[PDB]
Design an enzyme around this catalytic site. Structure first.
Site, PDB file in Angstrom:
ATOM      1  N   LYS A  18       0.992  -1.128  -0.049  1.00  0.00           N
ATOM      2  CA  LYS A  18      -0.068  -0.226  -0.207  1.00  0.00           C
ATOM      3  C   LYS A  18       0.788   1.386   0.061  1.00  0.00           C
ATOM      4  O   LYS A  18       0.895   2.000  -0.644  1.00  0.00           O
ATOM      5  CB  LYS A  18      -1.039  -0.222   1.475  1.00  0.00           C
ATOM      6  CG  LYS A  18      -2.425   0.871   1.520  1.00  0.00           C
ATOM      7  CD  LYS A  18      -2.060   1.619   2.864  1.00  0.00           C
ATOM      8  CE  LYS A  18      -3.418   2.909   2.491  1.00  0.00           C
ATOM      9  NZ  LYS A  18      -3.802   3.002   3.206  1.00  0.00           N
ATOM     10  N   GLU A  61      -6.197   9.317  10.976  1.00  0.00           N
ATOM     11  CA  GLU A  61      -4.936   8.762  11.104  1.00  0.00           C
ATOM     12  C   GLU A  61      -4.347   8.209  12.276  1.00  0.00           C
ATOM     13  O   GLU A  61      -4.249   8.925  13.275  1.00  0.00           O
ATOM     14  CB  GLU A  61      -3.728   9.441  10.498  1.00  0.00           C
ATOM     15  CG  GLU A  61      -3.255   9.592   9.040  1.00  0.00           C
ATOM     16  CD  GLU A  61      -2.028   8.599   8.124  1.00  0.00           C
ATOM     17  OE1 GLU A  61      -1.226   8.742   9.379  1.00  0.00           O
ATOM     18  OE2 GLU A  61      -2.460   7.108   7.681  1.00  0.00           O
ATOM     19  N   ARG A  62      -3.449   7.002  12.576  1.00  0.00           N
ATOM     20  CA  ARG A  62      -2.835   7.318  14.078  1.00  0.00           C
ATOM     21  C   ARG A  62      -1.902   7.595  14.217  1.00  0.00           C
ATOM     22  O   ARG A  62      -0.877   7.678  13.152  1.00  0.00           O
ATOM     23  CB  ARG A  62      -2.846   4.936  13.549  1.00  0.00           C
ATOM     24  CG  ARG A  62      -3.812   4.143  13.508  1.00  0.00           C
ATOM     25  CD  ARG A  62      -3.636   2.429  13.390  1.00  0.00           C
ATOM     26  NE  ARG A  62      -4.936   2.224  13.303  1.00  0.00           N
ATOM     27  CZ  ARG A  62      -5.551   1.287  12.238  1.00  0.00           C
ATOM     28  NH1 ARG A  62      -4.642   2.320  10.299  1.00  0.00           N
ATOM     29  NH2 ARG A  62      -6.856   0.926  12.230  1.00  0.00           N
TER      30      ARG A  62
END
EC number: 7.1.2.2
Lengths: 467, 25, 487, 48, 466, 414, 138
Positions: free
Chosen positions: E154, E180-181
Site C-alpha cells: 500500500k 490517522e494513527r
C-alpha cells in the site's frame, strides 16, 4: 416530617414535603392504610418533591394522602431469631407465627466490603452432580451462578444442591426468593419442615427465608434480594459463621428496576434495560461476598431472557461469579438432565494446581471430545458417516456416551424422570469418565449410559438392556 | 435467522465444499 | 455567591443539577457539602449537570456545591510500584500512603507526530504464539480481544510476570514497569489477581489501578486515564512502561451510563457520539519516543470483550480500528485444547518483525508459513481418505507446529527457550513423534537444556541468532534426546 | 469414478451457492438487528 | 463580532451573539486559550445563539468565555509552500518547520464545479503502472477505491503514483489522513522523506500532507478531508494541473460524519449512520473532478465494515467510484509486485467506447488467459501437469509469462531494491501484452519477464539469462 | 365485577354485563378484578389431577388443580382445541355426584372475533358443557381497555369458586392479544414504550394474573383455580421474549408445532419442548405406573431417530428404542371432541409401554386402539371400573390386562 | 445531483413529471425517466428523519410508498375525449445484491406495470442487456 402524595402512576409515587426533605433511600410510610405501605425515596425532583418506588400496591392511594418520613432506609429484623422464619421485603413475618423478636434491626442498604476485606482461599465444594463436579467445580465461599432460559432446570438444580449440600451444612442458610413462583416458596417451606431444616417447635432452625415473588409490584422485587442478602450478611459478620446463600432468581432484581425505569424518567439503554443496570448490579453483587470475617457460598439462579446469553442482564452478571453452570434448552430438549452445557460452564478452580491433574486432564479430555463431536455434528448430518476415519467415528461414539454419562437422575426430580435420584462422589465421577475416555466401554451401548449414577450402573444397565 | 446459527451453518458448509471439491478431483 | 458556588436543584441516578457555579470550567472537579466530589460534564445555560463521585444519598436538593478550581490530576512516579490504588490514585491495599512527589493530570494530549520514532524494541510476553507470530514492540498498542472467559487476562498476566527476567537484570533499558487497570471487575478477582502477582514477585514492578463493580460510574470511566498518566511518567523519563486496560468494554459502559443520564443523544447501542473519541484519545497516549525526548516508551494492552464473537459490534469495532493489531481468542479453540486460544490466522501485528529479535525471526518465519499452509488444508484431515503425501506432509507439520504453540499459564518463557523448542518441530525433529507427546517432549526437552545446556542458550541469547555452530549442537542435543525419549 | 466425480462437482457447486446465500442473509440480518436495536432505544428516549 | 459561550456539552459549544450572528459554517475563535480553538458553526438555534462543534478539546471552557467570529469558514494556507509540509485541519503546521507561509488562504467549505465547468469526456489518466494502466485504468477526475492494507505494498504504491504524477503530468499530490494513527502518520512521513517525495532541504517536495489524527474530536476528523481537498483544488483552479488526492481512509470520513451527527442530536438512520450520509459524501466527492481548468483524481482507501459490501457506508461510497485497485496478499506471495490483483481490480472506463477496441481487447485478453490458467491450476497440482494439450500447455506458459510481465520495479523503491524503477508508457503496455498473447515471445523464458519495464527489457534479460 | 354461580352458562362482556341477551345475571356478590394472589401460607402443593382427556397431555405433561399450564404455538396449530376438549371432558365429573371432583370452567376470549366465539359457545352448548362454563368475551372491536381487563375480570369470577372450596378452570385465550391491548392502552397514556414496544412491565402484566390460579389448603377451603393461558408464537419461535416471559410464570407448557401437525401428529404436541413442573404428583397411580418414564424415553427417541436418518450401523438397544418410539408416538395421537376417561388412557398406553405392540405395524396402531378400546369398554368394564376405582393397577388387574391385550392382539392380526 | 440539497433531489421527479404532463395533457406523448427512485427515497428519508418523523422499516418514514405512488400514478394513457395523449414512466430502482424483496424495490414493484430485472451474473457472463427474461414482466 410529613409529606403529601402529589402524583400516583403505577409503582411510582411522587411526594411533596413542606419542611424537611427525606434523603434518598429513606423509607416513608403512607398514612391511612389497612396494610403497611412503604415508599422508598428514589430521587429529589426539586421543589421539595421526591420521586419514590412503592413497596406494594398503589391501589386506593389518593392525591393529597399523608406520608411520614420514617427517617431511615428500610431496616429489617436481623439475627438468629430469623431462622426458621419467613419474611417480607420490609421485614414482616409472613408465616403467621408472630413477631420476629430480634435484638437488632438492619437497613437493607449498605456499602460493600472493602478491597482489604477480601479473601482468596479456594476450596472445591463437592456436590454429587457429575457434570458440575467434573467440569465446573463449585468452590466453598465462592460465587456460583446457574444460567438458564425459561424452564431449563435452574430451580431444580438449586433444589438438589440444597439437598446434597445445604442439608449437611453446619452453619446457616438464607434462601431469598426474588420474583419467582409463589407455589415454589410453599413447596420449599414445607419441605424444609418435613426434613427438619426448619423446626417450628424449637430453635433448631438452620435456614431463614425471605420472599418477594412474582405477584409483587416492581418495587418489592427490586428490594427482596437486598432484604435476603442483609439477613445473610449478619450471620457472616456479627456471628462470623459459614453462610450458604440461595437466590432464585437474581435476574428478577434487574427486571424489577427495568420495569419502573421509564417512570423514573430515563432514556432507555440497549435492549430496553435501564442505563444504570451494571452499577445497580455492582453495588449489590459486591455485598454478596466472603470476607475475612465470615464466608458466604452464594448460589444464584440467573434467568436468560429470550434464551439469549448476550442479553445485557445475564451478560452483565458473568463477571460477578467464580463458577458458572450454563444450562441449555438445546441439551434439555434431548432429555439430558441436568441440561448443563459442558462447553459453556466454567469454574475458577479448574486448575491443575487446585483440583489436580487427574481431575484436570479428564475434564479437559471430556471437553475436547465433546467439542470435536460438536464440530462434526453438522457435517455428518449431510455428508453422512461412511467417509469418516475409524479414528473419528470412535470419537463420535465416545462423545455420544459421555453426553449421556453426564446426565443424572436427581433426587428432587423423581416426579420428573421416573428414576431414583443418585448422588455420585467426586472419585466415582473422575474414574467413570477416565474409563470412557480410555476406551474401556466401547462395547456397551449408549443407552446404558443414560440416566444412571456411577459407571457400574451403566454396566449393569447394559445387561438389563442386553435383553 | 440468528447470526449465531447462520455462522454455525456457514462453518459446516465451507468445510463440506472443501472436502467435496477434493473428492471430485 | 452564585459565581463560585452553587445549590443543588435536583439529584438522582448520580447526576447532580447545580444552579450557580457560573465560573466553572468544563470537566472541573467540584465539591458537595457532604464532602463528595463531582466533575462538571455539562455546562448548560441554566445549570451545571454534575457527575457525582459516590453515593447520591449524601446529596440533597439545596446542598451547596463549591468549585475547587483544580482539574483532575493524580499521583505519579516510582513510589506507586507494588501498590493497589483506586482511580484517583488513593491507596486501597491498606499498606499506608503512597509517597508521591509528582502529580500528573489524567487527561493530557498524546505526544504528537514529531516526538516519536518507529516501534523497534521487542516487548516480550513469554508466550510463544504471541512472541513468534503476533510480535509486540514498545510503544505499540495491541488489543487482546475475545468472548468471556477465553484467556484474555491470562495473556496480560503472563506478560507482566515475564518482565522479571529483565527487571532483576542490570540493563536498565530492558526493564519494563507494569500497570494493570481493572475496570468493572469484582473485588475478589483483583484480590486474586494481586495475589498471583505477589506470589510471582511481579508486584515489585507493577502498579494496580482498580475501579471495581461497586465504584461509581465516573471512577470506572476515569480509571484508564489516571492509570495512563502513571505510565506516562515512565515513558517521558527515558523509562519503559506496559499498561493493561481490563476491559475497555466496561469503561465504555460507564461512560454510556453518564452520557444517557446527562441526556446527551444516543447513537447505535445507545453509545454517545463521542465514544470513539474516548478511546482514541486514551490509546494514542501510548507511543515510542525519540532519543531527543528520552527514547522512553508506553506499550498498551487494552482488553475488549466481544459477544458471540461479534468483532464488528460497536466498541470492538472502534478499538480494533484504533490499535496496531489484535490477538483474537476463541472458545472453540480453547475447548479443543489450544490454550492459549489464540486464533493465529486472524491475529495481527501491524508492527510485525520490526519488533522480533533475529533469533526468533530465524524460526518464526518458516513456522508462520507452514502454519498458514496447514490452515489451507486442515479441514481435509478428518475425511482425507486418500490424500497425496505432499499435503499429507503439511497436515503433519501442521499438528506438531500447533502443539508447539500450546502453553500452560504463569510460566512465560525466555526468548532463547522459545526458539530452541520451535526449532525442534520447525526443523522436522518432531515429525515422527506422536502429536499426543509433543507437550511432554517440549517440557522435558526444555527441562534438559535449561539444566544441562545453559551455555548454548546463553549463546543463542547473546549472539542473538542461531549460529551455524549452535545449530549443529542443537541438532545433536535433539537427535539424542529424542532417541532417549522413544526408548 | 465418473459418477462420484459428477456427484461431487454438483455437491461442491451447491455448497458454494449455499455459502453465497447464507452470507448475504447474514449481512441483511446483521444490519436489521442494529437498526432494530437502535430504533428501540430512540423510541424509549423520545417518550420521556 | 464577539460572542459569549452559553453552554459546553462535550465537543458541542453553544455561542450567543449580541449583535451580528455568524452564518452556518463560519469558524469562530475562542478567546484566551493556550492554543487555537476553532468552533465551526452548525445551526442557528434562534435567540441569537449558534450551535457549533469544537475542532479540539473543549476542556476548561467557561460559560461566558469570549468568542470571535472569524467571519468565514475554516481557511487554510494553500499553494506551493504547502508541498512537503504537514498540516492540521485549520491549516496549522504540525511538523515543526515553522509557519506555512503562502500568499493565498482558501476556505475549506467550497461548492462544486457547476455543470458548465464539467468536462464532457472520459480520458484515462496514465500512472505508468502496467497492471493499473492495462486492466483497471484510473480516470481523470475520477475516484478510485484502493483495497488491501498492510504487508501488501500500500504505501509504496501510494508513493510511486505520487512520483509518477509529478513525472508524467507535472501534477502534484495531497495526502489527507482522515483519522490517522499518530504512529502511522509519522511513519508515513519519514518513509516519503527517505524516498524523496518529500524534501526537507530544498523545494522539490511533490506532496503536501494534511492530517486528522485519531485523537482529534469528531468535527476535526470530519473536516480534514475537506482541508486536503482545498489544497488540491488550488493546484487545479489556480495552476491548472492534474492533482492527486489521497483520502486515507474513506470510511473514517463517514464515521466522523456520524459522530458529529449524533452529537448534534439528530436521529441516526439505517445501521446507525447519519441521516445525511449521502449528502455528507456527495458534497465532498463532487468537488473531485476534471473541470476546464484541470482535474483532481482521488485515491481513496476503503475499509468495508463487517465485510458487508451492502453496508450503508460502503454502498454509498461505491456510488462515486470509477475504479478499484485491489491490493492482494496472495499475489504478493507470488513475489509479484505491485501486488495488484488483475482479475479483482476494476474500472468503469474499461469500455472500447472509451479506451478503444485495441486497449479493450488486450485487457480482455490478459484476463481471460489469467482466468483459464486459474482453472487449470487445480488440475496441475493433483493429476499432475501433463494431460495438458499442445493448447493447454500454451495458455499456461503465456499466462505465467503474463503474470510476471504484470509485475514491475518502482522508482520509489530504488533506495531499497538496488534496482532501477520503470515507468512504462500506455503504448508500451498494450504492445507488451499484445505480443505475449500474440505468441511473439513464447520461446522466451518466464524469469525473463519478472520485474522489468517494457517488453524490450524482457528480451534483453533473456540474453543475460543465456 | 359480578361473581358467583349465577354466571354459569352465561356469556358476559369484560365487565360482567350479559351479551347472550338472555336476561340480567342474578348476582349477589361482587369482586375486585385486581386482587393480589394468595401468599405462601394459604396454599398447599398441587396434588389432584385435572384431566384433559388427551393422552399426550395427561400422560406426558400432567396438569394438577391449582396449576398453570400454558398452551403455546403458531396460528392454527390447535391451541384452542386443547382447551375445548378439556372443558368438554369435565362433564364426566360434573354430571357425577362427588362435588370435590367437579370443575367449573371459565373461557375468556380476547381480541378474538365475535363469530368465532359464537361458534365456540355453540359447540359448548351442543356438548352440554355451557351449564358449567361462564364465557367472558372481550372481542376484536371491544375497546382496548375492555380486552385488557377481560383476563382479570374472568379471573375474579374464578376465585369465587377457588375461595369457596369449589374448583374452577380458566382459559385465557389468548394472552398475546391482551398484551397488544395493554401496549396500546399504555402508549396512548404516553408511558414510554419499552422492549419490543411493550410497556416495561408486560411480564408483570401476566405474572400478577396467573399467580392467582392456585391451590388453597384445607384451612382455606381446599378449593383451587387452574389456568390454561394461550400465547401465539411466530415462526414457531418459542425463544421469543413474550413467549419466554409467559413460559417463566406458568407451571409448564404444551408446545404445538405446525410441522408435527402437517406430518399427522395431532395433537402437534412437541414432547421434548413441553413440560409440567408438577410432574407425576398431578397423576393418578394408574397413569404414573404406565407413563412414569415415557417422557424422557420419547425425548431420547427423537434424538436417535434423527441420528440414524442414515442407518449408521445401529445396534439393538437403539433399534428397540426406535421401535418403541414409533409405536408410542402413534398412541399419543388423538382426534377432536373425544376426551378419554383416565382408565381408557391407561388401558391403551399400557398396551404400548409394555411392548405388546412392538411387532404390530405402525400404520395399524391407530386402528388397533379403536378396536381394542371397543372391546374392553363393552366386554370388560369390570377391569376399567377397578383400575378407575382402585385408581391403581393392582397385580391381578395388570394380569387380566396382559391377558386381554396379547390375545385380542393375536386375533386382531389374523 | 449528488451535491444538491436533499429537498431538491426529493423535488426533481415531481417537476420533471409536470413537464411530461404538459405533453400528456395536449394530445402529445412524453417519456419520463426517473433515475433513480432509490436515491430520491434516501433524500426524502433524510428529510423525514431531520423533521423527526418516526423511522420505520429500514428507517424509512411511513409514507415513502406514497412518495412513489403519487409520482408514478401520473404516467397515464388518456382517451380521445381527453386528447389521446400519454405519459410513459421508466423509473429506475437500484437493488443491493440482487435482493428484489427489500422494502423499496417491493414498494415500487407494487406500483408499476411490470419490471425489467437486469442480473449481474448475466452481465459478466457477457449477456447484455443483462435482462432476466423469466423474472421480468410487462
Amino acid at each position: 416530617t410529613t409529606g403529601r402524595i402529589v402524583a400516583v402512576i403505577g409503582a411510582v409515587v411522587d411526594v411533596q414535603f413542606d419542611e424537611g426533605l427525606p434523603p434518598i433511600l429513606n423509607a416513608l410510610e403512607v398514612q391511612g392504610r389497612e396494610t403497611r405501605l412503604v415508599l422508598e425515596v428514589a430521587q429529589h425532583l426539586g421543589e421539595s418533591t421526591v420521586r419514590t418506588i412503592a413497596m406494594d400496591g398503589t391501589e386506593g392511594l389518593v392525591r393529597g394522602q399523608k406520608v411520614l418520613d420514617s427517617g431511615a432506609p428500610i431496616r429489617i429484623p436481623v439475627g438468629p431469631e430469623t431462622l426458621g422464619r419467613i419474611m417480607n421485603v420490609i421485614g414482616e413475618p409472613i408465616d403467621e407465627r408472630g413477631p420476629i423478636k430480634t435484638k437488632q434491626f438492619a437497613a437493607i442498604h449498605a456499602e460493600a466490603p472493602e478491597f482489604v476485606e477480601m479473601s482468596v482461599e479456594q476450596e472445591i465444594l463437592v456436590t454429587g452432580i457429575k457434570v458440575v463436579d467434573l467440569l465446573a467445580p463449585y468452590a466453598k465461599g465462592g460465587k456460583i451462578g446457574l444460567f438458564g432460559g425459561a424452564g431449563v432446570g435452574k430451580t431444580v438444580l438449586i433444589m438438589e444442591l440444597i439437598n446434597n449440600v445445604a442439608k449437611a451444612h453446619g452453619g446457616y442458610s438464607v434462601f431469598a426468593g426474588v420474583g419467582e413462583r409463589t407455589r415454589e416458596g410453599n413447596d420449599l417451606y414445607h419441605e424444609m419442615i418435613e426434613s427438619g431444616v426448619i423446626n417450628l417447635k424449637d430453635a433448631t432452625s438452620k435456614v431463614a427465608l425471605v420472599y418477594g415473588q412474582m405477584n409483587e409490584p416492581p418495587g418489592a422485587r427490586a428490594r427482596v434480594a437486598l432484604t435476603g442478602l442483609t439477613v445473610a450478611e449478619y450471620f457472616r459478620d456479627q456471628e462470623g459463621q459459614d453462610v450458604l446463600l440461595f437466590i432464585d432468581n437474581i435476574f428478577r432484581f434487574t427486571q424489577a428496576g427495568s420495569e419502573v425505569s421509564a417512570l423514573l424518567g430515563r432514556i432507555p439503554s440497549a435492549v430496553g434495560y435501564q442505563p444504570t443496570l451494571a452499577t445497580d448490579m455492582g453495588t449489590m453483587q459486591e455485598r454478596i461476598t466472603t470476607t475475612k470475617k465470615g464466608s458466604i457460598t452464594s448460589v444464584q439462579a440467573i434467568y436468560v431472557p429470550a434464551d439469549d446469553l448476550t442479553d445485557p442482564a445475564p451478560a452483565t452478571t458473568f463477571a460477578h461469579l467464580d463458577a458458572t453452570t450454563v444450562l441449555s434448552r438445546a441439551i434439555a430438549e434431548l432429555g439430558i438432565y441436568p441440561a448443563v452445557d459442558p462447553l459453556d460452564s466454567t469454574s475458577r478452580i479448574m486448575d491443575p494446581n487446585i483440583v489436580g491433574s487427574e481431575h484436570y486432564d479428564v475434564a479437559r479430555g471430556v471437553q475436547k471430545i465433546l467439542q470435536d463431536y460438536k464440530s462434526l455434528q453438522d457435517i455428518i448430518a449431510i455428508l453422512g458417516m461412511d467417509e469418516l476415519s475409524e479414528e473419528d467415528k470412535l470419537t463420535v461414539s465416545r462423545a455420544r456416551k459421555i453426553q449421556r454419562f453426564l446426565s443424572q437422575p436427581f433426587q428432587v426430580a423423581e416426579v420428573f424422570t421416573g428414576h431414583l435420584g443418585k448422588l455420585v462422589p467426586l472419585k466415582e465421577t473422575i474414574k467413570g469418565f477416565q474409563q470412557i475416555l480410555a476406551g474401556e466401554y466401547d462395547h456397551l451401548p449408549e443407552q446404558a449410559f443414560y440416566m444412571v449414577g456411577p459407571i457400574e450402573e451403566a454396566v449393569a444397565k447394559a445387561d438389563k438392556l442386553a435383553e | 435467522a440468528t447470526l449465531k446459527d447462520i455462522t454455525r451453518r456457514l462453518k459446516s458448509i465451507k468445510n463440506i465444499q472443501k472436502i467435496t471439491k477434493s473428492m471430485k478431483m | 455567591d452564585l459565581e463560585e458556588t452553587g445549590r443543588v436543584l435536583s439529584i438522582g441516578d448520580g447526576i447532580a443539577r447545580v444552579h450557580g457555579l457560573r465560573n466553572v470550567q468544563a470537566e472541573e472537579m467540584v465539591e458537595f457539602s457532604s464532602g463528595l466530589k463531582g466533575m462538571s460534564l455539562n455546562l448548560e445555560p441554566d445549570n451545571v449537570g454534575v457527575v457525582v463521585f459516590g453515593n447520591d444519598k449524601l446529596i440533597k436538593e439545596g446542598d451547596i456545591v463549591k468549585r475547587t478550581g483544580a482539574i483532575v490530576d493524580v499521583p505519579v512516579g516510582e513510589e506507586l510500584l507494588g501498590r493497589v490504588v483506586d482511580a484517583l490514585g488513593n491507596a486501597i491495599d491498606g499498606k499506608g500512603p503512597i509517597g508521591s512527589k509528582a502529580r500528573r493530570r489524567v487527561g493530557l494530549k498524546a505526544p504528537g507526530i514529531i516526538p516519536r520514532i518507529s516501534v523497534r524494541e521487542p516487548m516480550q510476553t513469554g508466550i510463544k504464539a504471541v512472541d513468534s507470530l503476533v510480535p509486540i514492540g514498545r510503544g505499540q498498542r495491541e488489543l487482546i480481544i475475545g468472548d468471556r472467559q477465553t484467556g484474555k487476562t491470562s495473556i496480560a498476566i503472563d506478560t507482566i510476570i515475564n518482565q522479571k527476567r529483565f527487571n532483576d537484570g542490570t540493563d536498565e533499558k530492558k526493564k519494563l514497569y507494569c500497570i494493570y487497570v481493572a475496570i468493572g471487575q469484582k473485588r475478589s478477582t483483583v484480590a486474586q489477581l494481586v495475589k498471583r502477582l505477589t506470589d510471582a514477585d511481579a508486584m515489585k514492578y507493577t502498579i494496580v489501578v482498580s475501579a471495581t463493580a461497586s465504584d461509581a460510574a465516573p471512577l470506572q470511566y476515569l480509571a484508564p486515564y489516571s492509570g495512563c498518566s502513571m505510565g506516562e511518567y515512565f515513558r517521558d523519563n527515558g523509562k519503559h512502561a506496559l499498561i493493561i486496560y481490563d476491559d475497555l468494554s466496561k469503561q465504555a459502559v460507564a461512560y454510556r451510563q453518564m452520557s444517557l443520564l446527562l441526556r446527551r443523544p444516543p447513537g447505535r447501542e445507545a453509545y454517545p457520539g463521542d465514544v470513539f473519541y474516548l478511546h482514541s484519545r486514551l490509546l494514542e497516549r501510548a507511543a515510542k519516543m525519540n532519543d531527543a525526548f528520552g527514547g522512553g516508551s508506553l506499550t498498551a494492552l487494552p482488553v475488549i470483550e466481544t459477544q458471540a464473537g461479534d468483532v464488528s459490534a460497536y466498541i470492538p469495532t472502534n478499538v480494533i480500528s484504533i490499535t496496531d493489531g489484535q490477538i483474537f481468542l476463541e472458545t472453540e479453540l480453547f475447548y479443543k485444547g489450544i490454550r492459549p486460544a489464540i486464533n493465529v490466522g486472524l491475529s495481527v501485528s501491524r508492527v510485525g518483525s520490526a519488533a522480533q529479535t533475529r533469533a526468533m525471526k530465524q524460526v518464526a518465519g518458516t513456522m508462520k508459513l507452514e502454519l498458514a499452509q496447514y490452515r489451507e488444508v486442515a479441514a481435509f484431515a478428518q475425511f482425507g481418505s486418500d490424500l497425496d503425501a505432499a499435503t499429507q506432509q503439511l497436515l503433519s507439520r501442521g499438528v506438531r507446529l500447533t502443539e508447539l504453540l500450546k502453553q500452560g499459564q504463569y510460566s512465560p518463557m525466555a526468548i532463547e527457550e522459545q526458539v530452541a523448542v520451535i526449532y525442534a518441530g520447525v526443523r522436522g525433529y518432531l515429525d515422527k513423534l506422536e502429536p499426543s507427546k509433543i507437550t511432554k517432549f517440549e517440557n522435558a526437552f526444555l527441562s534438559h537444556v535449561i539444566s544441562q545446556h545453559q551455555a548454548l542458550l546463553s549463546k543463542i541469547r547473546t549472539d542473538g541468532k542461531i549460529s551455524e555452530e549452535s545449530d549443529a549442537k542443537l541438532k545433536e542435543i535433539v537427535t539424542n534426546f529424542l532417541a532417549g525419549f522413544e526408548a | 469414478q465418473s459418477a462420484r466425480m459428477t456427484a461431487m462437482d454438483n455437491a461442491s457447486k451447491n455448497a458454494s451457492e449455499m455459502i453465497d446465500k447464507l452470507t448475504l442473509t447474514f449481512n441483511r440480518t446483521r444490519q436489521a438487528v442494529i437498526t432494530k436495536e437502535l430504533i428501540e432505544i430512540i423510541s424509549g428516549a423520545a417518550a420521556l
